PDB file of C-alpha atoms in Angstrom:
ATOM      1  CA  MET A  18     -11.338   4.275  -0.535  1.00  0.00           C
ATOM      2  CA  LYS A  19     -11.005   3.368  -4.227  1.00  0.00           C
ATOM      3  CA  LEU A  20      -9.162   5.608  -6.709  1.00  0.00           C
ATOM      4  CA  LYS A  21      -9.817   4.693 -10.325  1.00  0.00           C
ATOM      5  CA  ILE A  22      -7.510   6.090 -12.975  1.00  0.00           C
ATOM      6  CA  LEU A  23      -9.673   6.654 -16.062  1.00  0.00           C
ATOM      7  CA  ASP A  24      -6.833   7.889 -18.264  1.00  0.00           C
ATOM      8  CA  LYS A  25      -3.543   9.721 -17.918  1.00  0.00           C
ATOM      9  CA  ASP A  26      -5.366  12.900 -16.844  1.00  0.00           C
ATOM     10  CA  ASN A  27      -8.553  11.832 -15.004  1.00  0.00           C
ATOM     11  CA  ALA A  28      -9.529   9.718 -12.068  1.00  0.00           C
ATOM     12  CA  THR A  29     -12.580   9.184  -9.844  1.00  0.00           C
ATOM     13  CA  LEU A  30     -12.487   8.516  -6.136  1.00  0.00           C
ATOM     14  CA  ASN A  31     -15.024   6.502  -4.169  1.00  0.00           C
ATOM     15  CA  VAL A  32     -14.965   6.870  -0.388  1.00  0.00           C
ATOM     16  CA  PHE A  33     -17.068   5.812   2.566  1.00  0.00           C
ATOM     17  CA  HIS A  34     -19.178   8.643   3.964  1.00  0.00           C
ATOM     18  CA  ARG A  35     -21.632   7.464   6.642  1.00  0.00           C
ATOM     19  CA  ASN A  36     -23.895   4.537   7.558  1.00  0.00           C
ATOM     20  CA  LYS A  37     -23.961   2.322   4.474  1.00  0.00           C
ATOM     21  CA  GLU A  38     -23.383   5.291   2.126  1.00  0.00           C
ATOM     22  CA  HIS A  39     -20.395   5.874  -0.164  1.00  0.00           C
ATOM     23  CA  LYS A  40     -19.785   8.911  -2.349  1.00  0.00           C
ATOM     24  CA  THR A  41     -18.056   9.049  -5.721  1.00  0.00           C
ATOM     25  CA  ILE A  42     -16.096  12.206  -6.624  1.00  0.00           C
ATOM     26  CA  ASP A  43     -15.452  12.701 -10.335  1.00  0.00           C
ATOM     27  CA  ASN A  44     -12.880  14.832 -12.167  1.00  0.00           C
ATOM     28  CA  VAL A  45     -10.089  13.817  -9.813  1.00  0.00           C
ATOM     29  CA  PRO A  46      -6.732  15.093 -11.190  1.00  0.00           C
ATOM     30  CA  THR A  47      -3.943  12.508 -11.647  1.00  0.00           C
ATOM     31  CA  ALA A  48      -1.238  15.155 -12.053  1.00  0.00           C
ATOM     32  CA  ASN A  49      -0.624  15.898  -8.348  1.00  0.00           C
ATOM     33  CA  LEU A  50      -1.344  12.594  -6.498  1.00  0.00           C
ATOM     34  CA  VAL A  51       1.867  12.984  -4.519  1.00  0.00           C
ATOM     35  CA  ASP A  52       0.330  16.047  -2.816  1.00  0.00           C
ATOM     36  CA  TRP A  53      -2.793  14.314  -1.470  1.00  0.00           C
ATOM     37  CA  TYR A  54      -3.074  10.537  -1.878  1.00  0.00           C
ATOM     38  CA  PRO A  55      -1.696   8.599   1.122  1.00  0.00           C
ATOM     39  CA  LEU A  56       0.955   6.061   0.104  1.00  0.00           C
ATOM     40  CA  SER A  57       0.818   4.367   3.501  1.00  0.00           C
ATOM     41  CA  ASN A  58      -1.021   1.038   3.658  1.00  0.00           C
ATOM     42  CA  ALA A  59      -2.168   1.914   7.191  1.00  0.00           C
ATOM     43  CA  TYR A  60      -4.483   4.724   6.110  1.00  0.00           C
ATOM     44  CA  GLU A  61      -7.296   5.568   3.769  1.00  0.00           C
ATOM     45  CA  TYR A  62      -9.607   8.541   3.184  1.00  0.00           C
ATOM     46  CA  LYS A  63     -13.268   8.884   4.194  1.00  0.00           C
ATOM     47  CA  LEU A  64     -15.643  11.704   3.216  1.00  0.00           C
ATOM     48  CA  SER A  65     -15.931  14.384   5.874  1.00  0.00           C
ATOM     49  CA  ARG A  66     -19.182  15.016   7.724  1.00  0.00           C
ATOM     50  CA  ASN A  67     -19.944  18.031   5.446  1.00  0.00           C
ATOM     51  CA  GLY A  68     -18.644  16.697   2.105  1.00  0.00           C
ATOM     52  CA  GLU A  69     -16.018  19.424   1.575  1.00  0.00           C
ATOM     53  CA  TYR A  70     -13.052  17.375   2.856  1.00  0.00           C
ATOM     54  CA  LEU A  71     -11.371  14.022   2.534  1.00  0.00           C
ATOM     55  CA  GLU A  72     -10.236  12.988   6.009  1.00  0.00           C
ATOM     56  CA  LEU A  73      -7.667  10.358   6.995  1.00  0.00           C
ATOM     57  CA  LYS A  74      -8.516   7.161   8.890  1.00  0.00           C
ATOM     58  CA  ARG A  75      -6.036   4.739  10.414  1.00  0.00           C
ATOM     59  CA  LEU A  76      -6.642   1.098   9.535  1.00  0.00           C
ATOM     60  CA  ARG A  77      -5.881  -1.719  11.960  1.00  0.00           C
ATOM     61  CA  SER A  78      -2.239  -2.400  11.255  1.00  0.00           C
ATOM     62  CA  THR A  79       1.155  -2.705  12.900  1.00  0.00           C
ATOM     63  CA  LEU A  80       2.715  -0.359  10.337  1.00  0.00           C
ATOM     64  CA  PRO A  81       4.430   2.822  11.580  1.00  0.00           C
ATOM     65  CA  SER A  82       2.523   6.025  12.144  1.00  0.00           C
ATOM     66  CA  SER A  83       2.260   8.481   9.223  1.00  0.00           C
ATOM     67  CA  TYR A  84       0.846  11.982   8.665  1.00  0.00           C
ATOM     68  CA  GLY A  85       1.038  12.629  12.391  1.00  0.00           C
ATOM     69  CA  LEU A  86      -1.927  10.335  13.033  1.00  0.00           C
ATOM     70  CA  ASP A  87      -1.098   7.487  15.451  1.00  0.00           C
ATOM     71  CA  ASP A  88      -4.704   6.334  15.719  1.00  0.00           C
ATOM     72  CA  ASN A  89      -7.953   8.145  15.221  1.00  0.00           C
ATOM     73  CA  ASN A  90      -7.855  11.430  17.051  1.00  0.00           C
ATOM     74  CA  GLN A  91     -10.111  13.977  15.538  1.00  0.00           C
ATOM     75  CA  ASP A  92      -8.040  16.940  16.633  1.00  0.00           C
ATOM     76  CA  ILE A  93      -5.570  15.944  13.940  1.00  0.00           C
ATOM     77  CA  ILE A  94      -8.081  14.281  11.631  1.00  0.00           C
ATOM     78  CA  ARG A  95     -10.352  17.347  11.400  1.00  0.00           C
ATOM     79  CA  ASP A  96      -7.376  19.732  11.271  1.00  0.00           C
ATOM     80  CA  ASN A  97      -6.762  21.545   7.995  1.00  0.00           C
ATOM     81  CA  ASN A  98      -3.121  20.547   7.496  1.00  0.00           C
ATOM     82  CA  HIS A  99      -4.055  16.877   7.896  1.00  0.00           C
ATOM     83  CA  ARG A 100      -6.908  16.657   5.368  1.00  0.00           C
ATOM     84  CA  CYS A 101      -7.643  17.324   1.698  1.00  0.00           C
ATOM     85  CA  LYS A 102     -10.197  19.868   0.566  1.00  0.00           C
ATOM     86  CA  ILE A 103     -11.998  18.312  -2.379  1.00  0.00           C
ATOM     87  CA  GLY A 104     -11.092  19.939  -5.669  1.00  0.00           C
ATOM     88  CA  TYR A 105      -7.978  21.512  -4.096  1.00  0.00           C
ATOM     89  CA  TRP A 106      -6.222  18.139  -3.873  1.00  0.00           C
ATOM     90  CA  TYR A 107      -3.568  19.224  -1.375  1.00  0.00           C
ATOM     91  CA  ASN A 108      -2.876  17.542   1.999  1.00  0.00           C
ATOM     92  CA  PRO A 109       0.335  18.942   3.648  1.00  0.00           C
ATOM     93  CA  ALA A 110       0.870  15.989   6.079  1.00  0.00           C
ATOM     94  CA  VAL A 111       0.376  13.370   3.408  1.00  0.00           C
ATOM     95  CA  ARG A 112       2.540  15.355   0.951  1.00  0.00           C
ATOM     96  CA  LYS A 113       5.327  15.667   3.484  1.00  0.00           C
ATOM     97  CA  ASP A 114       5.537  11.937   4.178  1.00  0.00           C
ATOM     98  CA  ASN A 115       4.992  10.986   0.546  1.00  0.00           C
ATOM     99  CA  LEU A 116       8.035  13.087  -0.308  1.00  0.00           C
ATOM    100  CA  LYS A 117      10.311  11.203   2.085  1.00  0.00           C
ATOM    101  CA  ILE A 118       9.091   8.056   0.429  1.00  0.00           C
ATOM    102  CA  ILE A 119       9.871   9.520  -2.999  1.00  0.00           C
ATOM    103  CA  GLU A 120      13.411  10.409  -2.044  1.00  0.00           C
ATOM    104  CA  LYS A 121      13.931   6.889  -0.738  1.00  0.00           C
ATOM    105  CA  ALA A 122      12.731   5.439  -4.021  1.00  0.00           C
ATOM    106  CA  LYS A 123      15.059   7.767  -5.945  1.00  0.00           C
ATOM    107  CA  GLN A 124      17.905   6.454  -3.734  1.00  0.00           C
ATOM    108  CA  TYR A 125      17.083   2.816  -4.606  1.00  0.00           C
ATOM    109  CA  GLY A 126      17.274   3.512  -8.343  1.00  0.00           C
ATOM    110  CA  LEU A 127      13.496   3.483  -8.776  1.00  0.00           C
ATOM    111  CA  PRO A 128      11.570   5.877 -11.021  1.00  0.00           C
ATOM    112  CA  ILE A 129       9.455   8.451  -9.174  1.00  0.00           C
ATOM    113  CA  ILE A 130       6.032  10.004  -9.682  1.00  0.00           C
ATOM    114  CA  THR A 131       7.272  13.623  -9.457  1.00  0.00           C
ATOM    115  CA  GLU A 132       9.646  13.313 -12.403  1.00  0.00           C
ATOM    116  CA  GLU A 133       8.991  12.183 -15.955  1.00  0.00           C
ATOM    117  CA  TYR A 134       8.349   8.506 -16.561  1.00  0.00           C
ATOM    118  CA  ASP A 135       6.565   6.245 -19.017  1.00  0.00           C
ATOM    119  CA  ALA A 136       5.261   2.668 -19.022  1.00  0.00           C
ATOM    120  CA  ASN A 137       8.700   1.149 -19.737  1.00  0.00           C
ATOM    121  CA  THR A 138      10.432   2.999 -16.902  1.00  0.00           C
ATOM    122  CA  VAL A 139       7.697   2.067 -14.437  1.00  0.00           C
ATOM    123  CA  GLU A 140       7.954  -1.573 -15.550  1.00  0.00           C
ATOM    124  CA  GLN A 141      11.719  -1.407 -14.961  1.00  0.00           C
ATOM    125  CA  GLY A 142      10.970   0.039 -11.519  1.00  0.00           C
ATOM    126  CA  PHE A 143       8.768  -2.948 -10.672  1.00  0.00           C
ATOM    127  CA  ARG A 144      11.594  -5.234 -11.856  1.00  0.00           C
ATOM    128  CA  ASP A 145      14.011  -3.514  -9.506  1.00  0.00           C
ATOM    129  CA  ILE A 146      11.687  -3.441  -6.498  1.00  0.00           C
ATOM    130  CA  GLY A 147      11.085  -7.164  -7.029  1.00  0.00           C
ATOM    131  CA  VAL A 148      14.853  -7.595  -6.767  1.00  0.00           C
ATOM    132  CA  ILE A 149      14.835  -5.640  -3.514  1.00  0.00           C
ATOM    133  CA  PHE A 150      12.061  -7.787  -2.051  1.00  0.00           C
ATOM    134  CA  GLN A 151      13.890 -11.019  -2.919  1.00  0.00           C
ATOM    135  CA  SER A 152      17.283  -9.873  -1.522  1.00  0.00           C
ATOM    136  CA  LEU A 153      15.413  -8.707   1.578  1.00  0.00           C
ATOM    137  CA  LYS A 154      13.816 -12.145   2.084  1.00  0.00           C
ATOM    138  CA  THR A 155      17.346 -13.563   1.983  1.00  0.00           C
ATOM    139  CA  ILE A 156      18.639 -11.102   4.624  1.00  0.00           C
ATOM    140  CA  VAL A 157      15.640 -11.695   6.926  1.00  0.00           C
ATOM    141  CA  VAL A 158      16.331 -15.420   7.298  1.00  0.00           C
ATOM    142  CA  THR A 159      20.046 -14.743   7.508  1.00  0.00           C
ATOM    143  CA  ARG A 160      19.508 -12.468  10.501  1.00  0.00           C
ATOM    144  CA  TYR A 161      16.932 -14.677  12.186  1.00  0.00           C
ATOM    145  CA  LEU A 162      19.351 -17.638  11.870  1.00  0.00           C
ATOM    146  CA  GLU A 163      22.011 -15.785  13.799  1.00  0.00           C
ATOM    147  CA  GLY A 164      19.809 -14.916  16.746  1.00  0.00           C
ATOM    148  CA  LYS A 165      18.555 -17.734  17.538  1.00  0.00           C
ATOM    149  CA  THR A 166      21.833 -19.452  16.646  1.00  0.00           C
ATOM    150  CA  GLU A 167      20.998 -22.550  18.707  1.00  0.00           C
ATOM    151  CA  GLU A 168      21.957 -26.027  17.421  1.00  0.00           C
ATOM    152  CA  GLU A 169      18.190 -26.368  16.940  1.00  0.00           C
ATOM    153  CA  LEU A 170      18.837 -24.708  13.600  1.00  0.00           C
ATOM    154  CA  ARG A 171      18.198 -28.279  12.445  1.00  0.00           C
ATOM    155  CA  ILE A 172      14.554 -27.866  13.466  1.00  0.00           C
ATOM    156  CA  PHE A 173      14.225 -24.629  11.445  1.00  0.00           C
ATOM    157  CA  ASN A 174      16.051 -26.356   8.576  1.00  0.00           C
ATOM    158  CA  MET A 175      13.471 -29.139   8.663  1.00  0.00           C
ATOM    159  CA  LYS A 176      11.136 -26.646   6.883  1.00  0.00           C
ATOM    160  CA  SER A 177      10.886 -25.548   3.247  1.00  0.00           C
ATOM    161  CA  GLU A 178      12.339 -22.208   2.089  1.00  0.00           C
ATOM    162  CA  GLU A 179       8.900 -20.678   2.378  1.00  0.00           C
ATOM    163  CA  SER A 180       8.164 -21.852   5.947  1.00  0.00           C
ATOM    164  CA  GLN A 181      11.612 -20.641   6.980  1.00  0.00           C
ATOM    165  CA  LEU A 182      11.052 -17.222   5.378  1.00  0.00           C
ATOM    166  CA  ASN A 183       7.630 -17.119   7.061  1.00  0.00           C
ATOM    167  CA  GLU A 184       8.937 -17.890  10.569  1.00  0.00           C
ATOM    168  CA  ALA A 185      11.856 -15.472  10.248  1.00  0.00           C
ATOM    169  CA  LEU A 186       9.534 -12.682   9.014  1.00  0.00           C
ATOM    170  CA  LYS A 187       7.022 -13.463  11.770  1.00  0.00           C
ATOM    171  CA  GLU A 188       9.764 -13.059  14.383  1.00  0.00           C
ATOM    172  CA  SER A 189      11.823 -10.214  12.861  1.00  0.00           C
ATOM    173  CA  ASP A 190      13.179  -6.879  14.193  1.00  0.00           C
ATOM    174  CA  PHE A 191      11.348  -3.511  14.019  1.00  0.00           C
ATOM    175  CA  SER A 192      14.054  -2.339  11.588  1.00  0.00           C
ATOM    176  CA  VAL A 193      12.876  -5.014   9.121  1.00  0.00           C
ATOM    177  CA  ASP A 194       9.348  -3.762   9.708  1.00  0.00           C
ATOM    178  CA  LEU A 195      10.490  -0.271   8.642  1.00  0.00           C
ATOM    179  CA  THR A 196      12.079  -1.647   5.476  1.00  0.00           C
ATOM    180  CA  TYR A 197       8.896  -3.428   4.461  1.00  0.00           C
ATOM    181  CA  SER A 198       6.748  -0.369   5.285  1.00  0.00           C
ATOM    182  CA  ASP A 199       8.916   1.802   3.074  1.00  0.00           C
ATOM    183  CA  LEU A 200       8.881  -0.679   0.244  1.00  0.00           C
ATOM    184  CA  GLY A 201       5.122  -1.075   0.412  1.00  0.00           C
ATOM    185  CA  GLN A 202       4.647   2.671  -0.037  1.00  0.00           C
ATOM    186  CA  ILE A 203       7.063   2.729  -2.930  1.00  0.00           C
ATOM    187  CA  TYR A 204       5.133  -0.158  -4.542  1.00  0.00           C
ATOM    188  CA  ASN A 205       1.963   1.888  -4.178  1.00  0.00           C
ATOM    189  CA  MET A 206       3.656   4.810  -5.949  1.00  0.00           C
ATOM    190  CA  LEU A 207       4.876   2.662  -8.818  1.00  0.00           C
ATOM    191  CA  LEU A 208       1.353   1.293  -9.225  1.00  0.00           C
ATOM    192  CA  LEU A 209      -0.135   4.779  -9.455  1.00  0.00           C
ATOM    193  CA  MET A 210       2.489   5.458 -12.123  1.00  0.00           C
ATOM    194  CA  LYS A 211       1.714   2.225 -13.988  1.00  0.00           C
ATOM    195  CA  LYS A 212      -1.961   3.062 -14.064  1.00  0.00           C
ATOM    196  CA  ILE A 213      -1.403   6.644 -15.250  1.00  0.00           C
ATOM    197  CA  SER A 214       0.955   5.455 -17.959  1.00  0.00           C
ATOM    198  CA  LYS A 215      -1.276   2.642 -19.346  1.00  0.00           C
TER     199      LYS A 215
ATOM    200  CA  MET B  30      -7.899 -15.212 -15.471  1.00  0.00           C
ATOM    201  CA  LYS B  31      -6.137 -11.907 -16.155  1.00  0.00           C
ATOM    202  CA  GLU B  32      -9.245 -10.011 -17.248  1.00  0.00           C
ATOM    203  CA  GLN B  33     -11.575 -11.573 -14.683  1.00  0.00           C
ATOM    204  CA  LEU B  34      -9.157 -10.984 -11.804  1.00  0.00           C
ATOM    205  CA  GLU B  35      -8.948  -7.386 -12.994  1.00  0.00           C
ATOM    206  CA  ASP B  36     -12.737  -6.961 -13.004  1.00  0.00           C
ATOM    207  CA  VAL B  37     -12.699  -8.309  -9.419  1.00  0.00           C
ATOM    208  CA  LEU B  38      -9.939  -5.947  -8.357  1.00  0.00           C
ATOM    209  CA  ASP B  39     -12.076  -3.093  -9.657  1.00  0.00           C
ATOM    210  CA  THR B  40     -14.623  -3.961  -6.959  1.00  0.00           C
ATOM    211  CA  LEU B  41     -12.118  -3.860  -4.082  1.00  0.00           C
ATOM    212  CA  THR B  42     -10.661  -0.890  -2.227  1.00  0.00           C
ATOM    213  CA  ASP B  43      -7.159   0.368  -3.135  1.00  0.00           C
ATOM    214  CA  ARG B  44      -5.769  -1.502  -0.101  1.00  0.00           C
ATOM    215  CA  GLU B  45      -7.405  -4.883  -0.847  1.00  0.00           C
ATOM    216  CA  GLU B  46      -6.563  -4.714  -4.532  1.00  0.00           C
ATOM    217  CA  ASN B  47      -2.917  -4.065  -3.735  1.00  0.00           C
ATOM    218  CA  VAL B  48      -2.826  -6.949  -1.276  1.00  0.00           C
ATOM    219  CA  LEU B  49      -3.829  -9.162  -4.195  1.00  0.00           C
ATOM    220  CA  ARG B  50      -1.533  -7.593  -6.744  1.00  0.00           C
ATOM    221  CA  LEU B  51       1.411  -8.241  -4.393  1.00  0.00           C
ATOM    222  CA  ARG B  52       0.194 -11.719  -3.544  1.00  0.00           C
ATOM    223  CA  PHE B  53      -0.232 -12.842  -7.139  1.00  0.00           C
ATOM    224  CA  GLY B  54       2.739 -10.931  -8.501  1.00  0.00           C
ATOM    225  CA  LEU B  55       0.583  -8.915 -10.876  1.00  0.00           C
ATOM    226  CA  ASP B  56       3.096  -6.069 -11.171  1.00  0.00           C
ATOM    227  CA  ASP B  57       6.650  -7.311 -10.386  1.00  0.00           C
ATOM    228  CA  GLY B  58       5.954 -10.824 -11.652  1.00  0.00           C
ATOM    229  CA  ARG B  59       6.799 -12.498  -8.342  1.00  0.00           C
ATOM    230  CA  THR B  60       4.108 -14.103  -6.210  1.00  0.00           C
ATOM    231  CA  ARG B  61       4.552 -13.366  -2.505  1.00  0.00           C
ATOM    232  CA  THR B  62       4.011 -15.377   0.676  1.00  0.00           C
ATOM    233  CA  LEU B  63       1.075 -14.458   2.898  1.00  0.00           C
ATOM    234  CA  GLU B  64       3.805 -13.398   5.293  1.00  0.00           C
ATOM    235  CA  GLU B  65       5.598 -11.062   2.931  1.00  0.00           C
ATOM    236  CA  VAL B  66       2.216  -9.556   2.093  1.00  0.00           C
ATOM    237  CA  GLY B  67       1.173  -9.330   5.743  1.00  0.00           C
ATOM    238  CA  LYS B  68       4.432  -7.591   6.579  1.00  0.00           C
ATOM    239  CA  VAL B  69       3.876  -5.026   3.790  1.00  0.00           C
ATOM    240  CA  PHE B  70       0.445  -4.355   5.221  1.00  0.00           C
ATOM    241  CA  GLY B  71       1.230  -4.815   8.897  1.00  0.00           C
ATOM    242  CA  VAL B  72      -1.536  -7.430   9.241  1.00  0.00           C
ATOM    243  CA  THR B  73      -1.532 -11.165   9.903  1.00  0.00           C
ATOM    244  CA  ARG B  74      -1.196 -14.042   7.447  1.00  0.00           C
ATOM    245  CA  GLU B  75      -4.858 -14.839   8.186  1.00  0.00           C
ATOM    246  CA  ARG B  76      -6.197 -11.388   7.229  1.00  0.00           C
ATOM    247  CA  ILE B  77      -4.376 -11.619   3.902  1.00  0.00           C
ATOM    248  CA  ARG B  78      -5.913 -15.063   3.509  1.00  0.00           C
ATOM    249  CA  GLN B  79      -9.425 -13.636   4.100  1.00  0.00           C
ATOM    250  CA  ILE B  80      -8.841 -10.991   1.465  1.00  0.00           C
ATOM    251  CA  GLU B  81      -7.697 -13.657  -0.986  1.00  0.00           C
ATOM    252  CA  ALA B  82     -10.805 -15.720  -0.167  1.00  0.00           C
ATOM    253  CA  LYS B  83     -13.102 -12.727  -0.701  1.00  0.00           C
ATOM    254  CA  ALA B  84     -11.520 -12.227  -4.117  1.00  0.00           C
ATOM    255  CA  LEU B  85     -11.807 -15.872  -5.128  1.00  0.00           C
ATOM    256  CA  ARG B  86     -15.477 -15.849  -4.147  1.00  0.00           C
ATOM    257  CA  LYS B  87     -16.020 -12.729  -6.265  1.00  0.00           C
ATOM    258  CA  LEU B  88     -14.090 -14.376  -9.072  1.00  0.00           C
ATOM    259  CA  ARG B  89     -16.482 -17.337  -9.150  1.00  0.00           C
ATOM    260  CA  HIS B  90     -19.878 -15.542  -9.583  1.00  0.00           C
ATOM    261  CA  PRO B  91     -20.043 -13.176 -12.580  1.00  0.00           C
TER     262      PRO B  91
END
């Protein structure tokens, strides 16, 4: 799945179909992406057997479930409220979860794709999400260091800041996982906004 | 290699391109560890590394 934003109003979408074949759909509207485009890094669209629909596929990932698809179950995949009819550009499941993500971003002081924005405000949003990532990387090691409070902290502390951050992240709680999932989807949103506002 | 990296990203899927944007700090300015990136994608450090390698190989040829 590759969405190319051609200008503020127009995109094309290239998706796998079957065998070695991909299909490119032109005249893809940028206006409504929130209603169709999955923000989750654990999913992407493929072209449906008959070419009318874009259908979700779960990638191999430890990220949380979204859109009511835990893994690839064609009851849900083929179902109308879980896919996007091409040219209609509406996927209720995707829209529903996207909207939670949007509200979260609004709560963090980030600009959102459903309200007005321009290049400057998106750029400021990337500034702010970078700040969130950094603070987060501080908290992750803080929490790991408590756990895991053994006097062998000296061993951990024999590493560089990066190796420490890496080991803490590797070993972290599911809660932390949820924070990074959320932030990844918000990042995807801000990027769609950046591209539309170029 | 801002333009060349961009031409490469154009040949990747949304997911792979965003792995690399995160990694190289193309949007927020901050480069990220393979572990931060892997956490954002729910994949291992190694898978992120393979994506990065794929991109470097594409970056070399045309």
